[PDB]
């Protein structure tokens, strides 16, 4: 059953907090759609490339239209003496090119105390019933989310213009600066995020875009 | 500290629900509006034919 | 002894609450000082039941005004959805939403004497009219009236002073229409035509007027967003 | 045979109706073409129950933000009613009304480690404070805390991260307050003071933060008018 | 003047009926006399094939 | 259904009365059949022709 793919979580990437951060700075920005690629380069001695997708992203490739909700989970890796507060903002359409308010769009304020590992699910908030599925024309896909430490990308500027395939935009902003006992200017903190599919996920089409891909990436460069 | 241990089990079953974005409202008669039928089962999908390797 | 009215209203609350747009989560307890207000039945003087905030988009707005001269055949068209939503008064109350769904209501007011005996036609074209717009403008007015008479329309009589009420449904291939900045969806939902049917005359021994209003009903605003709406514009006439 | 759906919806109405702001009277009859919409239970997708138009003034807004340094005593004050009603987002939804009546709700958010052990005070002064404002600013901070502790206030603890909820009533010698342009009534309904109680320290072997929100509840907007509101202004911090 | 306003609504529902020319007299068994079947529905008619654009 | 076409009214044309008219003069004359054409000539700047018919 396809439900076994929509519901299998997966670790994607990490981003930093960098306590020497002002009260309103962008920490994370992503597009709400299941097709999020990850490209590696064969650490061992040869030249090879590959790509990875979450279980939700993998199962919607042979299809052309998708709809439903997606679930996100953020986990902060800090000690018992770290204090701070963060913000999560959702924009249904257009993107967030500038810092928004606190009640104009949907907002959430969460604090770093005795509890971590917050999760949130985004539902369908478009005027159309179904959206399109993202594809890639080459072996180096364009960036779909902003800094990810695994892929060696650290630009904090907001990317955009993917309205026809996505279900909005997620952003993470600081509210209260991170406090540490030792002292700043050299201290950071890492946050890990996971993606999933809500029980209302749906795909309905048939497509032939994967007709020339292959799972044999081992020796293809020569 | 109990809240930091229970939220560490695999699968994210100890995470805090956070009053999700909007609501879910889908009618049963949405397939009769779009695409005619559903595609929720991969076992049925794999019974179609595909061109391969003349 | 009486209540201390400072440390008689203190109480401790959880750090989790919601306000339909902002939700806060915390695990530490808070402190509350809740001072309640009075009933005061004499404090409600300017209380009516017409002006509200939910029923604000049902407020009529003048979108059209023309003066008719003797012995002339003319044609004039506007976009009712685009003009109404772009009014400066209406633009303010739709500023942090993304989508809209409502029905159009049009109303015409005529004024002419018993010495005029003229006639005019006012028709409406639903969604999809932009494709055949460069060619429809090339048809003579007489032949245009043939097609307009088969569509939802109204007839304006100048011998009397009567006519004009038009209820229109929401027809669209999507669920709502985007009203954010840069949208062209409102300017593609309908069209209003006002052309001469019979030229105006007069019994001598020289100008009539007409005014059109518009508003909406069963309005639904959804999808809060931090996006500016379509650039406001005062109606041309 | 089926209904003609053009001359099957025609009917004649009276020339008298009302729309809660515009009423028209006439003695001649009109003509109506009422085309009704469909039910479409599948047309409601982005439907929640938090974002509305009636409950728009209950949306929290950030009005204050400070950073606290070690070993310093300071004082800072703002006007909560004036800042909230002057926010650019809130100014748009109060634009054709004259009077308002609502209760204030304030909320503070603190964040400090277990190595800080500081304390701060936040007090509120009701209507009538403008008269004694040039003299109250001349009193030392220590003596100011004596009077603030007798008024509706809250205590901010830096060893923990807690505190801040304040419900305030509508106190005024009139029935409502004028919110039109040139009004000074909103800037005279209350005052918020934020001064040091005990200086902030730190266990070494250097900056804390604080944020204040505000909104309204049981809002009443009356007296429609064609008058612009108070000139909008972004909060200073 | 009431008679001039009611006769101005769209569709001509205020017009004066004028004792029409002759009468209508058609029997149910006229299709069995001419053409065999009826052509009153366009949805059925459109299910036939038409040559188009070799 | 074809009944929706037989029953949709349509404005065709106009004719005059011209009060300086004798007591028996012809004002209008037509054939009773549904195929009545109307030809126009593309008022705007080009040469184009077209025809129109009532819904019947």
Domain ranges of chain A: 1-222
How far is C-alpha A18 from the chain's CA centre? 19
Residue C43, classed as helix, strand or coil, is helix
Please list, in sequence order, all residues whose beta carbon lies within 8 angstroms of the beta carbon of residue C13, skipping any fewer than 6 positions away.
Answer: C29, C30, C31, C32, D165
Q: What single-letter DSSP state applies at residue B21?
A: B
Helices (H), D65-161: 80-85, 88-93, 141-148
Question: Up-side HSE of residue A195: CA atoms within 13 Å toward CB?
Answer: 22
Contacts of A124 in chain B (CB under 8 A): 22, 24
Please list, in sequence order, all residues whose beta carbon lies within 8 angstroms of the beta carbon of residue C204, skipping any fewer than 6 positions away.
Answer: none
Cα–Cα–Cα angle for D196, D197, D199, nearest 5°? 70
Please list, in sequence order, all residues whose beta carbon lies within 8 angstroms of the beta carbon of residue A142, skipping any fewer than 6 positions away.
Answer: none
d(CA D120, CA C102): 52
Please list, in sequence order, all residues whose beta carbon lies within 8 angstroms of the beta carbon of residue F26, skipping any fewer than 6 positions away.
Answer: none
Residue A34, classed as helix, strand or coil, is coil
d(CA D46, CA C223): 7
d(CA C63, CA C234): 9
d(CA C81, CA C215): 9
Q: Please tell me which chains touch C, using 3 or more CB pairs under 8 Å as the contact test.
A: A, B, D, E, F
- The answer to whether D133 and D181 have CB atoms below 8 angstroms apart is no
CA dihedral C123, C127, C133, C136 (to 10 degrees): -40
> What are the φ and ψ backbone dihedral angles of C64, each rounded to 5 degrees?
-155, 145
d(CA D125, CA D151): 7
List, in sequence order, every residue forming a beta bridge with D156; answer none if it has no partner. Answer: D120
- The answer to whether D214 and D91 have CB atoms below 8 angstroms apart is no
- The answer to whether D154 and D120 have CB atoms below 8 angstroms apart is no
Nearest residue in B to A128, CA atom:
B34
d(CA D197, CA D80): 21
Q: Give the length of chain B.
A: 54
- The answer to whether A50 and A94 have CB atoms below 8 angstroms apart is no
Helices (H), chain A: 55-59
Determination approach: cryo-EM
Tokens 């060696």 — which residue? Answer: A152
Burial of C61 (0-12, 13-18, 19+ CB in 10 A): middle
- The answer to whether A112 and D109 have CB atoms below 8 angstroms apart is no
Nearest CB among C139, C145, C146 relative to F43 is that of C139
Mutation test of the interface with chain F: which of D2, D8, D9, D33, choosing the one with the most F Cβ atoms within 10 A?
D2
Contacts of E5 in chain D (CB under 8 A): 12, 28-29
Q: Which helix (H) or strand (E) holds C86?
A: none
- Both tokens of E10, joined, read 């769209």
Query: Per the CB < 8 Å rule, is F3 touching E42?
Result: no
d(CA D13, CA C154): 13
DSSP calls for A91-144: ESSS--SS---SSSSEEEEEEESS---EEEEE----SSS-EE----SSSSPPP-
- Both tokens of C25, joined, read 């989560």
Whole-Å CA distances, A221 to A40, A52, A210: 14, 19, 20
Residue D237, classed as helix, strand or coil, is coil
- The answer to whether D223 and D97 have CB atoms below 8 angstroms apart is yes
Chain D residues 10-49 within an 8 A CB cutoff of chain E: 10-12, 28-29, 31, 33
Whole-Å CA distances, C131 to A128, C6, C125, C126: 22, 69, 12, 12
Tokens 């004694």 — which residue? Answer: D132
Q: What single-letter DSSP state applies at residue A55?
A: H
Residue A220 burial (CB count, 10 A): 12
Q: Please tell me which chains touch D, using 3 or more CB pairs under 8 Å as the contact test.
A: A, B, C, E, F
Q: What single-letter DSSP state applies at residue C90?
A: H
Please list, in sequence order, all residues whose beta carbon lies within 8 angstroms of the beta carbon of residue D199, skipping any fewer than 6 positions away.
Answer: D70, D71, D72, D73, D118
d(CA D65, CA D236): 9
d(CA D199, CA D201): 7
Nearest partner of D52 among D85, D93, D83, D107, judged by Cα: D93
Residue D82 burial (CB count, 10 A): 20
DSSP calls for F1-56: -GGGTTT-----------SS--SS-------SSS---EEE--SSSS---EEE----
D40–chain F nearest CA distance, Å: 23
d(CA A150, CA A146): 12
Tokens 């991170």 — which residue? Answer: A178
Q: What single-letter DSSP state applies at residue A76?
A: E
- The answer to whether D45 and D175 have CB atoms below 8 angstroms apart is no
Residue D132 burial (CB count, 10 A): 10
List, in sequence order, every residue forming a beta bridge with D184; answer none if it has no partner. Answer: none
Contacts of D33 in chain E (CB under 8 A): 10
Mutation test of the interface with chain F: which of C132, C135, C143, C145, choosing the one with the most F Cβ atoms within 10 A?
C143
Q: Which helix (H) or strand (E) holds A203?
A: strand A202-203
Q: Do chains B and E touch by CB distance (3+ pairs < 8 Å)?
A: no
Strand bridging mode D61-69 / D32-34: unpaired
- Both tokens of C229, joined, read 């709406």
Residue D149 burial (CB count, 10 A): 13
- Both tokens of D119, joined, read 């304390």
- Both tokens of A69, joined, read 């909700």
At what resolution in Å was this solved?
A: 3.0
How far is C-alpha C6 from the chain's CA centre? 50
CA dihedral C5, C8, C9, C10 (to 10 degrees): 130
- Both tokens of E5, joined, read 């306003």
Residue C174 burial (CB count, 10 A): 14
d(CA D58, CA D25): 38
Contacts of C142 in chain F (CB under 8 A): 13
d(CA F21, CA C12): 97
Burial of D111 (0-12, 13-18, 19+ CB in 10 A): buried
- The answer to whether D122 and D192 have CB atoms below 8 angstroms apart is yes
User: Across the beta sheet with A131-132, what order do the strands follow?
Assistant: A131-132, A65-67, A202-203
**What's the distance, Cα to Cα, between the start and end of chain E in Å?**
63
Cα–Cα–Cα angle for D98, D102, D107, nearest 5°? 130
- Both tokens of C41, joined, read 């039945």
- For C8-17, the CB contacts below 8 A with 24+ separation are C9/C33, C9/C34, C9/C35, C13/D165, C15/D162
**What's the distance, Cα to Cα, between the start and end of chain D in Å?**
70
d(CA A116, CA B18): 13
- F11–chain E Cβ distance below 8 A for any pair: no
- The answer to whether C144 and C136 have CB atoms below 8 angstroms apart is yes
Nearest partner of D35 among D3, D78, D73, D76, judged by Cα: D3
Nearest CB among A81, A175, A176 relative to D114 is that of A81
Q: What single-letter DSSP state applies at residue B37?
A: S
How far is C-alpha A199 from the chain's CA centre? 19
Residue A60 burial (CB count, 10 A): 25
Residue F19 burial (CB count, 10 A): 5
Q: Please tell me which chains touch E, using 3 or more CB pairs under 8 Å as the contact test.
A: C, D, F
**What's the distance, Cα to Cα, between the start and end of chain B in Å?**
63
Please list, in sequence order, all residues whose beta carbon lies within 8 angstroms of the beta carbon of residue D85, skipping any fewer than 6 positions away.
Answer: D91, D94, D100, D179, D186, D229, D230
Q: Which helix (H) or strand (E) holds E2?
A: helix E2-5
Query: Per the CB < 8 Å rule, is C153 touching E10?
Result: yes
How far is C-alpha C197 from the chain's CA centre? 28
- The answer to whether B44 and B51 have CB atoms below 8 angstroms apart is no
- The answer to whether A27 and A155 have CB atoms below 8 angstroms apart is no
């Amino acid at each position: 059953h396809l439900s076994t793919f929509f519901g299998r979580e997966a670790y994607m990437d990490r981003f930093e907090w960098k306590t020497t951060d002002s009260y309103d700075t962008l920490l994370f920005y992503t597009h709400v759609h299941p097709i999020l690629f990850k490209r590696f380069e064969a650490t061992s001695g040869d030249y090879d490339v590959g790509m990875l997708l979450p279980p939700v992203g993998y199962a919607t490739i042979p299809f052309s239209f998708w709809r439903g909700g997606m679930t996100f989970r953020f986990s902060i890796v800090a000690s018992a003496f770290h204090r701070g507060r963060l913000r999560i903002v959702y924009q249904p359409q257009g993107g967030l090119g500038t810092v928004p308010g606190f009640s104009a769009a949907f907002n959430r304020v969460i604090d770093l105390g005795d509890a971590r590992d917050f999760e949130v699910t985004v539902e369908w908030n478009q005027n159309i019933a179904f959206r399109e599925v993202h594809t890639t024309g080459s072996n180096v896909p364009s960036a779909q989310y902003t800094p990810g430490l695994d892929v060696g990308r650290t630009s904090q500027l907001p990317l955009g213009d993917q309205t026809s395939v996505s279900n909005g935009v997620l952003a993470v902003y600081v509210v209260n600066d991170l406090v540490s006992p030792d002292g700043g200017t050299d201290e950071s903190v890492e946050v890990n995020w996971f993606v999933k599919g809500a029980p209302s996920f749906e795909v309905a089409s048939r497509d032939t875009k994967f007709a020339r891909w292959s799972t044999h990436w081992s020796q293809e460069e020569f | 500290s109990p809240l930091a241990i229970a939220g560490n089990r695999a699968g994210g079953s100890g995470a805090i629900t956070l009053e999700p974005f909007g609501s879910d409202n889908t009618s049963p008669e949405l397939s009769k509006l779009h695409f005619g039928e559903t595609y929720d089962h991969m076992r049925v999908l794999v019974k179609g034919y595909n061109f391969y390797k003349a | 002894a009486v209540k201390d009215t400072i440390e008689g209203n203190s109480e401790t609350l959880s750090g989790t609450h919601q306000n339909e747009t902002l939700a806060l989560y915390s695990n530490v307890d808070q402190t509350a000082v809740k001072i309640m207000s009075s009933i005061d039945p004499t404090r409600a003087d300017c209380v009516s039941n017409d002006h509200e905030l939910g029923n604000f988009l049902s407020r009529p707005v003048r979108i059209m005004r023309e003066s008719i001269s003797l012995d002339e055949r003319t044609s004039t068209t506007i976009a009712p959805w685009d003009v109404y939503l772009r009014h400066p008064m209406i633009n303010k109350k739709i500023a942090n939403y993304e989508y809209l769904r409502a029905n159009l209501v049009l109303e015409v007011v005529v004024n002419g004497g018993p010495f005029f005996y003229g006639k005019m036609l006012l028709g409406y074209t639903p969604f999809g009219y932009e494709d055949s717009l460069k060619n429809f403008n090339r048809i003579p007015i007489g032949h245009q009236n043939t097609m307009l008479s088969q569509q939802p329309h109204v007839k304006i009589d100048f011998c009397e002073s009567t006519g004009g009420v038009l209820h229109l449904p929401f027809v669209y291939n999507r669920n709502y229409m985007r009203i954010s900045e840069g949208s062209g969806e409102p300017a593609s939902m309908g069209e209003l035509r006002l052309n001469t049917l019979n030229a105006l005359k007069n019994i001598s021994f020289s100008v009539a007027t007409i005014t059109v209003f518009a508003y909406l009903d069963n309005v639904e605003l959804v999808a809060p967003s931090a996006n500016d709406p379509i650039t406001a514009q005062q109606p041309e006439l």
